[PDB]
Design a binder for this molecule. Structure first.
Ligand SMILES: CCCCC/C=C/C/C=C/C/C=C\C/C=C\CCCC(=O)O[C@H](COC(=O)CCCCCCCCCCCCCCCCC)COP(=O)(O)O[C@@H]1[C@H](O)[C@H](O)[C@@H](OP(=O)(O)O)[C@H](OP(=O)(O)O)[C@H]1O
Ligand SMILES: CCCCC/C=C/C/C=C/C/C=C\C/C=C\CCCC(=O)O[C@H](COC(=O)CCCCCCCCCCCCCCCCC)COP(=O)(O)O[C@@H]1[C@H](O)[C@H](O)[C@@H](OP(=O)(O)O)[C@H](OP(=O)(O)O)[C@H]1O
Ligand SMILES: [K+]
Ligand SMILES: [K+]
Ligand SMILES: [K+]
Ligand SMILES: [K+]
Lengths: 144, 332, 332, 144, 332, 332, 144, 144
């Protein structure tokens, strides 16, 4: 669509997140840090090495067909997210409470904004009980 | 700043090598252990009078080495508190020192300075350097594991202790009765208890032995039972150690899953909520985060049959049979 | 009455602390064990003539303490029979006393009074206080476990006993033949048997050793085999103890499920049969009973993979495949 | 319905089984004892703490929507009751005989009336054999 | 005939009690074992010259008892061959005797008669009564299990033997070098080998000990390694024994299923093929056979999770998924 | 050629018997081990002066035998390099010799020739024949297993070492304090350390024993703890050995599956791609390859419950539930 | 039907296989031995005790409704027979060959006539290979 | 069909791959070696002994009905091939890459021609990624 081609216009030079097709790992990291991401050089490198066509940063951006075209609706995603809830869902049955959600989000891993976590507790499941069904959440990411 | 990040890197690295070793980090602790062990050995040598002047000379030099490394150890350790908001600032360093092992480190430091300054007090201070030795295992691990296993297998252990104790009480009595007269080793029941303890543990010094035929028959007969019983706790503890550490490894393995799970859910919700500066940002975050996060999560998910595999199995099967019912009622 | 329920509470509590200890309740039994152990130790000391008057004084005082605590133990224990219709009333107390350990408690009581009243009879009575010591484990647990495990692993044990016995018979014979002449320890085959028993058990007193080169070669060769064989039962018993107690724990765990199951089914049927005094009653019983009962049942249901998890697995799967067939024949 | 609203009329003050919205745990226990229930104070407390909106006894009775509206037809109930039979159903196949039913009911847990147990042996499954199918019983509670 | 079936019953019963004991049947073999053990003990006593005439008298009487019980044992055993077409008739009894243990039973019989008739030959014959003792385990079970386990865990065992042997070779050498001069126990490397064997096995007679400080340091250092290594085979064998016998129990358990399976299939096919003398016959055979056979089969089917439960699980699941595919292709 | 294939067969067979033994192949290595063991024994005998001339004669003859077998061993081994393109040709034989054990084989060869040609150098060369002995295990297996297990169970082992060491340090100190005065064995703390090591390992030479009552009480009390602790590593290692070798067996078992899998896929693709000389060829290859390959694959697939069976289980179940969803959405 | 009622006529007195309603276990055994069955007294006793209404031999023959009315088509039967084949079906896949069938029948358990075993090898599965499908056999007993 | 009967014409004498119905194992091996197969005598023997009617090489070629008539579409084949991929499909998900295919084919077992392996990497799955779905491959052999 319009947004896809518009982003592909920048992607033609920013396959490694830069202005020229190159490895541009450090440039990508600096650009992300300017954007506020502030990534790690090793984190950028591993990622570039994994999904790649040329395998040297200057891939011929087949990720045009990966990012937009892939709806991220892979059943592997649903299974992975279900497993991700499992480690937090002690005894299951939608075990997560919104309190636990905010706790993990704001205290562990990437500490997302408390406002973003509140928006998660609202949009993902408005009920906010200790029995939030996980099928909705995996759909919430995939389809819902 | 480049100097600032060099500061941070060395900060964190020395912190890890001092407080939480792993891999080659153990070489430094091996160095310290050999240092303190050498101090102990050199003290033992200093006891042997026929050659002690050389021991004293080498001991003074070793004490200089100990003093310098321990003081530097303390300073570097306290400074090595710049890896978290936890122990930062002057007040944070104070709380880092309130931690009990840092205390006894300070005491062994001052004990060393007292020894080099300079008989009860001297014996005390040297004993304090031996306190460093016993302080080797900081975070209790050798003690916690032992206590945990002893408590877990309490039944087995009490059985062994009870029966072994009771065999020791009665065998000693009977042998003492048999040999009260002829044998002179068994002058009193206390002696018989000593003999029984040395025998049932299979030490067998041989200073106290039965002599009468009846005594020997009783000793052998009871030996069979006892010998079997006093050796039992070692086997129980060995099995329990293996089992407990296996359990700890499994548990410790599961938290390794905890980080990726948060990674995946943070990335997923943030990226979904977001969905051409902004579009390039979303593109990159989608691609890099998911390709990395899902990957790592997966390599962290599969192993350990025990209960883990069968738990995932049951979960998947439960929704499968749930939908079997659902689809059949939907058809008819 | 408030006095009546205080009576009931103390009744039950002292009953539990005396008959079925758990947690901190073990402190009292530790007290009793230390008391009897101290009596044994003080008797042993009284044997040592060179100082016995102090031992006798302290022993008399300790016997007073024993007399008072044991009598109070008996009375409190018998009174501590008000927790069930089982041992209530005068006749119930009589049946509580007919229980065999209460008997030997009475005998140790009267033995103590006889000792304080007051050489064969005295030795007997003191032996009766030692009978209390062996009575420590009331409900057989150290004995029952040992016998159960010995019987369970009977094959392994008999193999070890047979081969070890036979090695001991032949090694002793051969060594006796080798050293019949030069060595004086092995004067007769009996001596050789003594040596073989002490050697194969790894006691090794060293009063009887081979001297000829042939004897030593034979002794070492047979030692390897034997030493391996006499140590075997300890390992077998250790493994068997661990296994048996694990099984007991599992079994004991399952009865914990038994109570909630009855709770759930009683509540369910009663509430269903019932379905605004009556309506408020039904409301409360529904809400409270189910919310509690289902809960507790659940926390009691999940763990233990072994066979439990796979039994529930198979049950659910069986009706699932049953309905697979049913739905397919219903479709066509 | 009529009975639901009539009971809600008392419930407005007896959310903790009393005449006023309060913790009223001891009052609830005494009232039940007068009714013949004779509960325990700890039993009342745990229950009140579990299902609650205000979490202090004086909940705003959302149990109006719990007790009547919940048909107690949760699949968790069916699974729980099946498991409850399992511990008594040695070798399964409807293993329970009416004799075992009366034995457990009148000898263990709550000792229900022998007449009530006979009514159970009649209504729940008239056959009274050693092969009483458990699906009927879980339906018997849920639907049948 | 009633006499004929009494004959058959006693035939079979004595056969079982002699050849394949179980339960209380072991009491007779215990009797025989105590008999032969008493013979051994009485011989040992006869060796002790200072009292042997009483031993000789009691030994002659015991030999009478042995002679009579062994002869009756032989005759009853051979006669006890009427439970199968296998060993029936004169020729069948001959083949029953060709069985090797029956041979050595005959030899111990004739040895006993020779002893009572009546110094090398006498020693030989008495040795033959000891041959009966070693013949106790007829069907190899103590030997077969030991050999099986040794072979199964061959790797572990060879590791232990190799490293232990090599530690013993080198520790002995080094200690011999250290103490060749001062100590007189270590006169030659042979002596050092003797010391090393006695030390590493933890016997420790103490006739040969290190004396120089260097020797003691080496001895202790090598002791740690060795002591750990020579004790290893006992643990390996204990574990292997437990495992192997567990496997045997499982296997032996499965053949118990074999009989009912044949029962069910024989009954099923015969009854089906058959389907009012004939009708009453079919009625009875249906009812009784199935109600018994299915029952017994079931009580023989359920236990043992290991692989058994999961094998039935997989079988049922395989046809279930087979029909999942079948029904889905049948629908569309 | 027939001579050429005889060459190849003997080539391969001798290669296997020399480098990778299995089954009866071990007889040759047993021969070599007995040869070197005999050399060691004969050297030991040569040390005993009172008879050494016979030992020297037999040793010279044995050295001839060693020289000839070792040289032939070397030549046959190097020639036995015609089973792969790996070590063929003159250059290939050179690389086969660069392999380190072939080196030390060459050195023991030249050491033997030096010994027969002909006191430090002689002792060295004989030591080189002992080097052959230690070279017995070529491919590290006794060493690799030991190191692997020690590393795997590092936690348990360090606990045992730490606590045992610390008990040994303190018990020795306390006993030395108790018996510093009366007893003469404990003249210095070094002596007390010797006593403690001999006691806690249950060797118990008995050259150093406590004498005072306090000393004995302390010795017994600490003995209980220690004795339990020094025996622990043997149990840990035994369990670890069993576990590790079991794991190796499982792993080694899986590669056995690897060959058939390739067979099946090669046959399948080739035959499919092909589909009356050509038709007869395809017929034969289909029939023979599949009937053999599928067969062998199957007999290689079934056993080992552990994770293997449950992995196949999960795989099949995953596509089954996948199609459950698929068929239900296809219906509606 | 005719045969069912005709056999019930004898069954009214032969519930324990005799001429009078009684325990008649020994009489039943002797009658069977005359018929050629030759059973054991203990075998007769256990059987009578198991399936019984009066539980003393003189049951009011509810086995009229058991034997004829029960088609012996219980799924327990099919599962049991499948398991019975399993112990003989090493590696499965219809593992039984007719040779193994005759071997087990004529050498183990009840040694049925070799002619009967040949009739089994014919009627049950004419193919007589080593892959005789077991579903046919369980149907063969149940339905086929 | 025409090819089936034409090959059966040679098969009538080459049931053991020769000109006369006989054991002809060595003759079959020599004929295959001439054809370029170069088999082993033991390999030929085991095969002949397994699938056979006369069980001596000179079988009455029921393999006319085996080879052509059997489409080799047995579900055992599909399961076997799936298992065969499993041992190479570490972590599954079509784990095989064409590189691994060529590696195993040309380095292990039977070292098929690199051209044949390239034709495999083309025909079996043109994609040549590390996620080649195995269902296509088992169909590829069976149906596809
Ligand atoms: C010829 C031949 C010579 C033969 C010998 C070969 C030598 C072998 C050496 C092999 C191993 C190298 C060291 C590896 C090693 O240390 O292994 C460690 C065990 O460490 C300790 O117990 C921590 C240290 C505790 C004890 C400290 C003092 C020990 C002094 C020993 C003196 C012994 C004296 C010897 C004399 C003998 C008697 C006189 C296992 O490491 P791990 O893989 O289990 O991982 C760690 C470990 O378990 C930690 O213990 C644990 O923390 P703790 O709570 O303290 O247990 C970590 O969890 P957290 O991060 O959550 O806290 C785990 O993450
Ligand atoms: C009265 C009564 C007398 C009582 C005794 C009865 C005797 C019992 C003998 C029983 C067993 C026969 C021998 C079986 C045997 O050797 O079993 C082997 C173990 O072999 C070794 O460890 C390889 C050899 C390592 C050690 C070599 C020197 C050993 C010298 C021992 C001297 C001991 C001296 C004795 C004196 C005692 C103390 C003074 C287990 O064989 P396996 O079934 O595990 O299969 C092999 C084996 O595991 C190999 O070890 C392994 O290679 P490595 O990497 O070298 O381990 C193969 O894998 P790869 O093909 O992938 O390489 C495996 O495929
Ligand atoms: K010892
Ligand atoms: K000793
Ligand atoms: K020992
Ligand atoms: K000793």
């Amino acid at each position: 669509t319009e947004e896809q081609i518009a982003e592909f216009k920048e992607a033609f030079s920013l396959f490694d997140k830069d202005g020229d097709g190159t490895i541009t790992t450090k440039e990508l990291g600096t650009v992300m840090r300017s954007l506020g991401q502030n990534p790690t050089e090793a984190e950028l490198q591993d990622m570039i090495n994994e999904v790649d066509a040329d395998g040297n940063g200057t891939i011929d951006f087949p990720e045009f067909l990966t990012m937009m075209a892939r709806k991220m609706k892979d059943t592997d995603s649903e299974e992975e997210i279900r497993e991700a809830f499992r480690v937090f869902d002690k005894d299951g049955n939608g075990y997560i409470s919104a309190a636990e959600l905010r706790h993990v989000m704001t205290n562990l891993g990437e500490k997302l904004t408390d406002e973003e976590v509140d928006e998660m507790i609202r949009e993902a499941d408005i009920d906010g009980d200790g029995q939030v069904n996980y099928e909705e959440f995996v759909q919430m990411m995939t389809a819902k | 700043s480049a100097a600032h990040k060099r500061y941070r890197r060395l900060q964190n690295w020395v912190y890890n090598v001092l407080e939480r070793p792993r891999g080659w980090a153990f070489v430094y602790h091996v160095f310290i252990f050999l240092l303190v062990f050498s101090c102990l050995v050199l003290s033992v040598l200093s006891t042997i009078q026929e050659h002690q002047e050389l021991a004293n000379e080498c001991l003074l030099i070793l004490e200089f080495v100990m003093i310098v490394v321990f003081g530097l150890e303390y300073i570097v350790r306290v400074w090595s508190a710049g890896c978290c908001c936890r122990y930062r600032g002057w007040q944070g360093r104070f709380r880092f020192a309130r931690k009990p092992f840092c205390v006894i480190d300070f005491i062994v430091f001052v004990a060393s300075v007292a020894v080099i300054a300079a008989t009860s007090a001297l014996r005390s201070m040297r004993f304090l350097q031996i306190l460093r030795m016993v302080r080797m295992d900081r975070r209790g691990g050798t003690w916690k594991l032992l206590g945990s296993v002893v408590y877990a297998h309490s039944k087995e252990l009490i059985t062994a202790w009870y029966i072994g104790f009771l065999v020791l009480i009665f065998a000693s009595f009977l042998v003492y009765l048999a040999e009260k007269d002829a044998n002179s080793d068994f002058s009193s029941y206390a002696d018989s208890l000593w003999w029984g303890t040395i025998t049932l543990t299979t030490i067998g010094y041989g200073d106290k032995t039965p002599h009468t035929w009846l005594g020997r028959v009783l000793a052998a007969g009871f030996a069979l039972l006892g010998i079997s019983f006093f050796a039992l706790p070692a086997g129980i503890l060995g099995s329990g150690f293996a089992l407990k550490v296996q359990e700890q490894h499994r548990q410790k393995h599961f938290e390794k899953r905890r980080m990726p799970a948060a990674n995946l859910i943070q990335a997923a919700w943030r990226l979904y909520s977001t969905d051409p500066a902004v579009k390039t940002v979303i593109r990159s975050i989608r691609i890099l985060k998911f390709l990395v996060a899902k990957r790592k999560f997966k390599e962290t998910l599969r192993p350990y049959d025990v209960k883990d595999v069968i738990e995932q199995y049951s979960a998947g099967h439960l929704d499968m049979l749930g939908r079997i019912k659902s689809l059949q009622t939907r058809v008819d």
